[PDB]
Amino acid sequence: MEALVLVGHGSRLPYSKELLVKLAEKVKERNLFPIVEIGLMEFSEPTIPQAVKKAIEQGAKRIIVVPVFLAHGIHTTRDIPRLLGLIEDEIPEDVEIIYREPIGADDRIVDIIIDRAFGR
Amino acid sequence: MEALVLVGHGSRLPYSKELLVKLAEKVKERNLFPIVEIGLMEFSEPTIPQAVKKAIEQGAKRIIVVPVFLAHGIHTTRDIPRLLGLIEDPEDVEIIYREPIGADDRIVDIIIDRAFGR
């Protein structure tokens, strides 16, 4: 009934997509959502509209979109909201989009950064 | 004798720099490094060269540069290594260029919190 759609920037290099793919597979291992999909804003497929459409086709009525971005930027305030039809510039009536917050300066990001600082 | 330099993308919007400032503030509260600085690749200051120079001028002999990026891209493979002089485009000072965040289990934890509005 509900889907998690992870959306990322995309890249002409493969690492941004590989990131989202690994993150989605880990989320799937958690067994929290019946439907998990990824979408890339630019350069690579699946795109964000394709990811949302896939979620709908699989039967999701609530689509939770999590922007896998560290900070807000034009991507998360304009481009992705536009793609999702959330701001003015096909979502069935019985489907709601829930657009969530980016990662931000989470304490766990500090933990990761310190590990990286020490090469771990 | 060692500094942590957090480098971020930078943005015409203020959120990217605000993120790096807040992260640096939280690192400083953990009292692990005598010197902590931020640098932004573009659009905004401190720049990455300025951040490294500040660290050196404060006496750091080993500069640990952590790219605050989720995944590698042209910025972490080309642009930042070039600014740091690590690839073709300081005597007693060593630059240690670390890995980005990547698909860390803790990113999954954050994503799930965000998914549920937390």
Swiss-Prot record, chain A:
Domain of life: Archaea
Enzyme class: lyase
Catalytic residues (positions): H9
Pfam families reported in the protein's UniProt record: CbiX (PF01903)
Naturally occurring in which organism (per UniProt): Methanocaldococcus jannaschii (strain ATCC 43067 / DSM 2661 / JAL-1 / JCM 10045 / NBRC 100440)
Residues given in the record as substrate binding sites: E45, L70, A71, H72, G73, I74, H75
Quaternary organization: Homotetramer; dimer of dimers.
Name assigned to this protein: Sirohydrochlorin cobaltochelatase
HAMAP family: CbiX
InterPro entries associated with the record: CbiX-like (IPR002762), SiroHydchlorin_Cochelatase (IPR023652), Sirohydro_Cobaltochel/CbiX (IPR050963)
GO molecular function: cobalt ion binding; nickel cation binding; sirohydrochlorin cobaltochelatase activity
Annotated S-S bridges: none
PANTHER family according to UniProt: SIROHYDROCHLORIN FERROCHELATASE, CHLOROPLASTIC
Pathway the protein takes part in: Cofactor biosynthesis; adenosylcobalamin biosynthesis; cob(II)yrinate a,c-diamide from sirohydrochlorin (anaerobic route): step 1/10
UniProt-annotated binding residues for Co(2+): H9, H75
Keywords, in A-Z order: Cobalamin biosynthesis, Cobalt, Lyase, Metal-binding, Methanogenesis, Nickel
Residues given in the record as Ni(2+) binding sites: H9, H75
